[PDB]
Ligand binder design. Structure first.
Ligand SMILES: Oc1ccc(-n2ccnc2)cc1
Ligand SMILES: Oc1ccc(-n2ccnc2)cc1
Ligand SMILES: [Mn+2]
Ligand SMILES: [Mn+2]
Ligand SMILES: [Mn+2]
Ligand SMILES: [Mn+2]
Length: 201
């Protein structure tokens, strides 16, 4: 089939808020989304997975974690996750340092993606086009915080998480895996997938 552009793919399959945040992330670290286009799509994907991971999860009036998929959560509900990803470096560390001074949770060396108020820990979300065990070890060796929980998703449905503790229910993680499957399929229809996959390196 015809080779599409990754720019068109990103603009057509990601929400404009997500695309704008990814452009900002790349600008912040001196990269151009129109040149590093596979990285651009990977950042969009990672942002979306982090938002999907936190979606619908609340802590109820008794302090227990619950799932509310309706648009209107009860007003006494607390969001279960703090989202650190998707923020500029000053604001992201402002949110982190805060949680750390507040809860007593130690400070990470690298910015994590979420904070889980149920499990009382930071989370590093990974999305890989390679094998999850390889990618898991690379991340574990990098952060080595050992209080920060790692949860890796692949595009073919495999997952790996710290201590085999997957945090979320099957249905929530299935929403994420379904979305990743969709991204891969749509990229493949545009003849973008093979190169995107091989670019992770
Ligand atoms: O090549 C890049 C650029 C920016 C990135 N980023 C900064 C903040 N969040 C993602 C990651 C990778
Ligand atoms: O000004 C911003 C906004 C979002 C950013 N970001 C997106 C994903 N990770 C960080 C970076 C910079
Ligand atoms: Mn709300
Ligand atoms: Mn980021
Ligand atoms: Mn991050
Ligand atoms: Mn991450």
């Amino acid at each position: 089939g015809p080779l599409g552009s990754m720019e068109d793919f990103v603009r057509q399959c990601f929400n404009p808020m997500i695309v704008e945040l990814a452009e900002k992330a790349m600008k912040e670290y001196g990269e151009d989304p129109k040149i590093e286009t596979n990285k651009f799509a990977a950042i969009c994907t990672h942002l979306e997975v982090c938002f999907m991971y936190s979606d619908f999860h609340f802590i109820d009036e008794r302090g227990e974690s619950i799932i509310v998929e309706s648009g209107d959560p009860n007003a006494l509900l607390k969001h279960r996750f703090e989202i650190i990803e998707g923020r500029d470096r000053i604001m992201a560390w402002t949110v982190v340092n805060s949680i750390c001074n507040t809860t007593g949770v130690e400070k990470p060396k690298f910015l994590p993606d979420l904070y889980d108020y149920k499990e009382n820990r930071f989370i590093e979300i990974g999305v890989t086009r390679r094998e999850v065990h390889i990618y898991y070890l690379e991340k574990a060796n990098k952060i080595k915080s050992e209080k920060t929980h790692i949860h890796i998703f692949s595009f073919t449905g495999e997952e790996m998480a710290t201590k085999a503790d997957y945090t979320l229910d099957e249905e929530s993680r299935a929403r994420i895996k379904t979305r990743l499957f969709t991204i891969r399929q749509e990229m493949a229809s545009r003849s973008l997938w093979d190169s995107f996959r091989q670019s992770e390196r």
